[PDB]
Design a protein around this ligand. Structure first.
Ligand SMILES: CCCCCCCCCCCCCCCCCC(=O)OC[C@H](COP(=O)([O-])OCC(O)COP(=O)([O-])OC[C@@H](COC(=O)CCCCCCCCCCCCCCCCC)OC(=O)CCCCCCCCCCCCCCCCC)OC(=O)CCCCCCCCCCCCCCCCC
Ligand code: BCL
Ligand code: BCL
Ligand code: BCL
Ligand code: BCL
Ligand SMILES: CC[C@H]1c2cc3[nH]c4c(c3C)C(=O)[C@H](C(=O)OC)c4c3nc(cc4[nH]c(cc(n2)[C@@H]1C)c(C(C)=O)c4C)[C@@H](C)[C@@H]3CCC(=O)OC/C=C(\C)CCC[C@H](C)CCC[C@H](C)CCCC(C)C
Ligand SMILES: CC[C@H]1c2cc3[nH]c4c(c3C)C(=O)[C@H](C(=O)OC)c4c3nc(cc4[nH]c(cc(n2)[C@@H]1C)c(C(C)=O)c4C)[C@@H](C)[C@@H]3CCC(=O)OC/C=C(\C)CCC[C@H](C)CCC[C@H](C)CCCC(C)C
Ligand SMILES: COC(C)(C)C/C=C/C(C)=C/C=C/C(C)=C/C=C/C(C)=C/C=C\C=C(C)\C=C\C=C(/C)CC/C=C(\C)CCC=C(C)C
Ligand SMILES: CCCCCCCCCCCC[N+](C)(C)[O-]
Ligand SMILES: CCCCCCCCCCCC[N+](C)(C)[O-]
Ligand SMILES: [Cl-]
Ligand SMILES: [Fe+3]
Lengths: 240, 281, 301
């Protein structure tokens, strides 16, 4: 009957819909590779999709995906076993090298712009009209490491202008340089900002930016990543 | 085989138990100690399900059902053939669920990310445990729990529900429903908004969050933002399940009469209880 | 370990009047206030809203619908404010009796009103639909919100308009009432022989529950990778960074398949819209084609 028709038709449409959805999520990271980077033989059931092209705003070119995938960076790792499937140990300092939970991605080395083509993230000292509206103002507070030692002082907040939120703490170190700290990775407290992921000796190791008033996408990933890696790698110096 | 960007992440470490013993992958799947446990409780639990099917006399999956003990056994044990299999299988289901959550924590640590996902997943384990463990214990028998079968678990919902009249009138049910509905609204909106900005009118450049925020403000006068929407979705759906377990823990324990009659507390409020007219009096 | 569920600091700048593109700025309000309460969870900014002809038309008839219902609730309450507050859940505006069939000749006290308020709702909602399409068009955005909205309109249209017309009577439609629309629901299921045997019901439940699972995961993950700027769902598409890489690797390592930053939002929109799309078909077939989902289920078809 008509309802039996309805439901087979649906289960067929549902099967094509999943196929569509499945191939749409192959647009990054494919084709699969062997651990040495050659293409894997078994690529799975579904084929790759017909490439699509995004038009990046502000004359920033296009992106076509799926496209050629190069890491565009060096990976400091060696095999630990003779067969596929095991970990790859770092061959240097994973925090410096940028592997594991400290990884970054070779993103454009330009800053994300807003709808009007201006830098999306500015240090508050250059963001006209912007102030702390609620909560504790971190500017001026000292920054503490997971080893309970003091590493620097907050000298500014870096703010998303179109989204109106704090994104980085600009921290001043003992030598006078500053670094950005991911705001998602600090605990602002009444008398200090606490950073669980870094001991104090690792604060100078945070990647630095090339212009004091702008941060680029690469820069964002390198900084962010390095801070997350300390969770795993700076654990030889952390108490409760 | 590895995703094109994946090798730089398959580093040692992050395990909770076992050190570097189960620190490896099989295909795309990370194992770890709790991968092993998951597979153990899952494989063991599956065997007993097929065993239950031997005794029941059917292999049709639309008929295999594994029922809890009778109410008569209370909160004690029962024979394998008459309710004990549900007891083992239930222990295994929990084992497989909790090892799944724990294995997700291990995956999180390697990757250096937040623990939000297993935390969210733990609310669904809460709901399951309310139905098969917390509610039966308080009520005094495993019989009050639901059976493991496709269509028979649907008979439990209908029968448990209809025992208190229209279950619609459970006030926690109502709240739980609402969150379930709002989450779907918010999901369709979030899905549509991202896609509508990444996939604009043909020939145009990609839009920006600016566009997304302008679209909401133009439409309802308020835009929650891009961090707010994920805050909102995690929170909407976690509440939905929470009030589900809650509507269900109070039913048969502290409220066992019909749920429509609970609303009479409101109507008998003394300052209007005897005013004539309207629907009541 | 801070969890990013609330903001620790709030920053404020000038009110954001919004992108312009092809929008007629004569129809944007003043920026409303700034909610600090809202600012811990999301944006502090209220307004500006955009109202044009379709806005007023929708908002007008949207209120006319609401008022009609509440006017009849006072008449039911005999105009006593105390009775009103007491039996508020119990009042109900009901569709015309079966006798009147599909005619509009029904008396006011026995339908008619329901037909008035129903029409006002019908104008309000379709107005609002065209508003979501036209608001996107002005900003040059895709029409995904409007097509997804159409899937909720589907179910609503079926429940109170398409299915009544097919059954031959306005009486089949849903009443206007808190406890009374609940009862219509239970009843509907009983008369058609347990909706749990309707396969579109059980699918629509699958997607309901699946949308809670999916938004639970998507939200948890983006929070889990907001330390890498993941909440920035869009530039991560133009230029995959580590947030997108590790979010993909969580799901590949946990359960074996792939999710791109854009790709997972296609899961979102479809999981959601399928709730009301599947459900609408199940309610539409109920009583038009199928009298008893248990008996239909017995013949499996
Ligand atoms: C019983 C019978 C069976 C039961 C089930 C019947 C279900 C019918 C659903 C059909 C919807 C088709 C939509 C479509 O082609 O999607 C556009 C399309 C591209 O969207 P995009 O790339 O984001 O935007 C492109 C441009 O920007 C252009 O973007 P845009 O902004 O112009 O629109 C983007 C897209 C947005 O896609 C959606 O969100 C779909 C929502 C559909 C809800 C409709 C509910 C209707 C109520 C009933 O909107 C549409 O094109 C939908 C048109 C609405 C038709 C009514 O997505 C797909 O390709 C979906 C493929 C589905 C595969 C089905 C397999 C069929 C197997 C054989 C049978
Ligand atoms: C889908 C099957 C049934 C149905 C079954 C239920 C059940 C079951 C419940 C509700 C509940 C509610 N329903 Mg109803 N509901 C239906 C159709 C509707 C329609 C409509 C088509 O126009 C409307 C306006 C409502 C409105 C409402 C609210 C009073 C309430 C919470 C909704 C919500 O979370 O929204 C999202 C929020 C927004 C602001 C938008 N229902 C149909 C007829 N509805 C719940 C409640 O608490 O009732 C007291 C509840 O328990
Ligand atoms: C006739 C029946 C009654 C009624 C009686 C009941 C009863 C009885 C119950 C509900 C419950 C619920 N009902 Mg009610 N309800 C009715 C009408 C409705 C209507 C409606 C439109 O009218 C709606 C929308 C709802 C909605 C809901 C929710 C509030 C809730 C279910 C979600 C939940 O608990 O998830 C929680 C999720 C889980 C328990 C799943 C957990 C998954 C686990 C952790 C992992 C499983 C993995 C699996 C094995 C993996 C395997 C596959 C692969 C191998 C990997 N009810 C009618 C009036 N309702 C239930 C509830 O609140 O439960 C707590 C409940 O007990
Ligand atoms: C939550 C409140 C009620 C209840 C009320 C309902 C109602 C009402 C309905 C279902 C529906 C379903 N329920 Mg039930 N359900 C309950 C608890 C459970 C539990 C559990 C806690 O362990 C499980 C595994 C299931 C499983 C299922 C599926 C048979 C089906 C679709 C689920 C779905 O899409 O989810 C969302 C999840 C996803 C989209 C992710 C993928 C999940 C996959 C498909 C799970 C398959 C499990 C498989 C059949 C059994 C396990 C494999 C084992 C190794 C044997 N229910 C409790 C008691 N359930 C619907 C149905 O059609 O049933 C016939 C339906 O109408
Ligand atoms: C005792 C009752 C029966 C029952 C009878 C029904 C009936 C009858 C129906 C459902 C429906 C549904 N049921 Mg059932 N169902 C029961 C048991 C359950 C159980 C369970 C026990 O666990 C669950 C989880 C469900 C789950 C579901 C949902 C999947 C589905 C509704 C989808 C939805 O999003 O609607 C919510 C969304 C809408 C109704 C769309 C609204 C769109 C409009 C445009 C909104 C306009 C708002 C208006 C302008 C007001 C705005 C006000 C302010 C401006 C904010 N049922 C038992 C078996 N169920 C529906 C369905 O699809 O069935 C297939 C349905 O009609
Ligand atoms: C995909 C399925 C889900 C869905 C989707 C959905 N709903 C939507 C949209 C989408 C994609 C919109 O774009 C649209 C919107 O504008 O959202 C902010 C809307 C919307 N969903 C609404 C309600 C709604 N949706 C519901 C359900 C769902 N919507 C499904 C669960 C429900 C439920 C669960 O019953 C409700 C109550 C509104 C918030 C809005 C449509 C508003 C509207 O039609 O307004 C006209 C009425 C007035 C202008 C005045 C009314 C008077 C006052 C009460 C006083
Ligand atoms: C809390 C909000 C929602 C939620 C969230 C959620 N679910 C999650 C997660 C999160 C955040 C995960 O991270 C995790 C995951 O990996 O998702 C892909 C998961 C998950 N949610 C799942 C299912 C699921 N979630 C549901 C619900 C929800 N999940 C909530 C609505 C439901 C519903 C509504 O019924 C189901 C069925 C899985 C896809 C996965 C957990 C997989 C897992 O634990 O695997 C280990 C166990 C096995 C492989 C099998 C063990 C077998 C048993 C020993 C024997 C069978 C016993 C069982 C009781 C039989 C029951 C069947 C009958 C009742 C029909
Ligand atoms: C404070 O007091 C005042 C008076 C100021 C205000 C108070 C108002 C009150 C008390 C409001 C309360 C409202 C309530 C409780 C509303 C509840 C609504 C619910 C639960 C609705 C549920 C479902 C409705 C559906 C499915 C409606 C569907 C309708 C349609 C699909 C369109 C119908 C169209 C028809 C019949 C055709 C119309 C005619 C033409 C020519 C198109
Ligand atoms: C979901 C509803 C969200 C809240 C919508 C209310 C915000 C309206 C703001 C308009 C106010 C502008 N005005 C008139 C004060 O100048
Ligand atoms: C959709 C409405 C949700 C709004 C949530 C409002 C909650 C207020 C939270 C305040 C806590 C913030 N702080 C810093 C004081 O902890
Ligand atoms: Cl609420
Ligand atoms: Fe919003």
């Amino acid at each position: 009957d008509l309802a039996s028709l309805a439901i087979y038709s649906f289960w067929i449409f549902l099967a094509g819909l999943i196929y569509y959805l499945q191939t749409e999520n192959m647009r990054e990271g494919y084709p699969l590779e062997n651990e040495d980077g050659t293409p894997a033989a078994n690529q799975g059931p579904f084929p790759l999709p017909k490439p699509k092209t995004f038009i990046l705003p502000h004359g920033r070119g296009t992106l076509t995906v799926p496209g050629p995938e190069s890491e565009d960076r060096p990976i400091a790792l060696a095999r630990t076993a003779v067969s596929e499937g095991f970990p790859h140990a770092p061959t240097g300092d994973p925090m410096k090298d940028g592997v594991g939970p400290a990884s970054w991605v070779a993103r454009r080395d330009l800053p994300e712009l807003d709808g009007h083509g201006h830098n999306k993230i500015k240090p508050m000292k250059a963001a006209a009209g912007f102030h702390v509206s609620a909560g504790k103002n971190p500017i001026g507070l000292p920054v503490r490491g997971c080893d309970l030692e003091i590493a620097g002082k907050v000298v500014d907040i870096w703010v998303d202008i179109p989204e109106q939120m704090a994104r980085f703490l600009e921290v001043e170190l003992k030598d006078g340089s500053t670094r950005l700290l991911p705001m998602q990775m600090v605990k602002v407290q009444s008398n200090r900002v606490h950073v669980n992921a870094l001991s104090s000796d690792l604060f100078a190791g945070i990647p630095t930016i090339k212009s004091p008033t702008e941060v680029t996408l690469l820069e964002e990933d390198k900084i962010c990543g390095y801070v997350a890696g300390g969770l795993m790698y700076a654990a030889p110096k952390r108490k409760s | 085989a590895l995703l094109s960007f994946e090798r730089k992440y398959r580093v040692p470490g992050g395990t909770l138990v076992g050190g570097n013993l189960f620190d490896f992958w099989v295909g795309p799947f990370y194992v770890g100690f709790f991968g092993v446990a998951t597979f153990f409780f899952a494989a063991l639990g599956i065997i007993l399900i097929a065993w239950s099917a031997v005794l029941q006399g059917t292999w049709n999956p639309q008929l295999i059902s594994v029922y809890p003990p009778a109410l008569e056994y209370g909160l004690g044990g029962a024979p394998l053939a008459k309710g004990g299999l549900w007891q083992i299988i239930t222990i295994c289901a929990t084992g497989a669920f909790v090892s799944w959550a724990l294995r997700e924590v291990e995956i999180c640590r390697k990757l250096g990310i937040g623990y939000h996902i297993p935390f969210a997943f733990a609310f669904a384990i809460l709901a399951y445990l309310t139905l098969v463990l917390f509610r039966p214990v308080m009520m005094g028998a495993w019989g009050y729990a639901f059976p493991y079968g496709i269509w028979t678990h649907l008979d439990w919902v209908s029968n448990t529900g209809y025992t208190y009249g229209n279950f619609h009138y459970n006030p926690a049910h109502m709240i739980a429903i609402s969150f379930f509905f709002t989450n779907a609204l918010a999901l369709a909106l979030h899905g549509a908004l991202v896609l509508s900005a990444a996939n604009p009118e043909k020939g145009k450049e990609m839009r920006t969050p600016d566009h997304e925020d302008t679209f909401f403000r133009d439409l309802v006068g308020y835009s929650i933002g891009t961090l707010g929407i994920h805050r909102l979705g995690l929170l909407l759906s976690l509440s939905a399940v929470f009030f589900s377990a809650l509507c269900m823990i109070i039913t048969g324990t502290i409220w066992f009469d019909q749920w429509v009659d609970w609303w009479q507390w409101w109507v008998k409020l003394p300052w209007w209880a005897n005013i004539p007219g309207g629907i009541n009096g | 370990e801070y969890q990013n569920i609330f903001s620790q600091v709030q920053v404020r700048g000038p009110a954001d009047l919004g992108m312009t593109e092809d929008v007629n700025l004569a129809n944007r309000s003043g920026v409303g206030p700034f909610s600090t309460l809202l600012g811990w969870f999301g944006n502090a900014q209220l307004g500006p809203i955009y109202l044009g002809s379709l806005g007023v038309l929708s908002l007008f008839s949207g209120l006319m619908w609401f008022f009609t219902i509440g006017i009849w609730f006072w008449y039911q309450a005999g105009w006593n404010p105390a009775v009103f507050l007491r039996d508020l859940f119990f009042f109900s505006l009901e569709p015309p009796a079966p006798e009147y069939g599909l005619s509009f000749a029904a008396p006011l006290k026995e339908g008619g009103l329901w037909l008035i308020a129903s029409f006002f709702m019908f104008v309000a909602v379709w107005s609002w639909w065209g508003r979501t399409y036209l608001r996107a068009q002005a900003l040059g955005m895709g029409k995904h919100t409007a097509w997804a909205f159409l899937s909720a309109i589907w179910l609503w249209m079926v429940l109170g308009f398409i299915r009544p017309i097919l059954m031959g009577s306005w009486s089949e439609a849903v009443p206007y009432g808190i406890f009374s629309h609940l009862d219509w629901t239970n009843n509907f299921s009983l008369v058609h022989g347990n909706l749990f045997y309707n396969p579109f019901h059980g699918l629509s439940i699958a997607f309901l529950x699946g949308s809670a699972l999916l938004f639970a995961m998507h939200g948890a993950t983006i929070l889990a990778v907001s330390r890498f700027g993941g909440e920035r769902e869009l530039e991560q598409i133009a230029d995959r960074g580590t947030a997108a890489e590790r979010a993909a690797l969580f799901v590949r390592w946990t359960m074996g398949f792939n999710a791109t930053m854009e790709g997972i939002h296609r899961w979102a929109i479809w999981m959601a819209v399928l709730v009301t799309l599947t459900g609408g078909i199940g309610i539409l077939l109920s009583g038009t084609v199928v009298d008893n989902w248990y008996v239909w289920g017995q013949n499996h078809g």
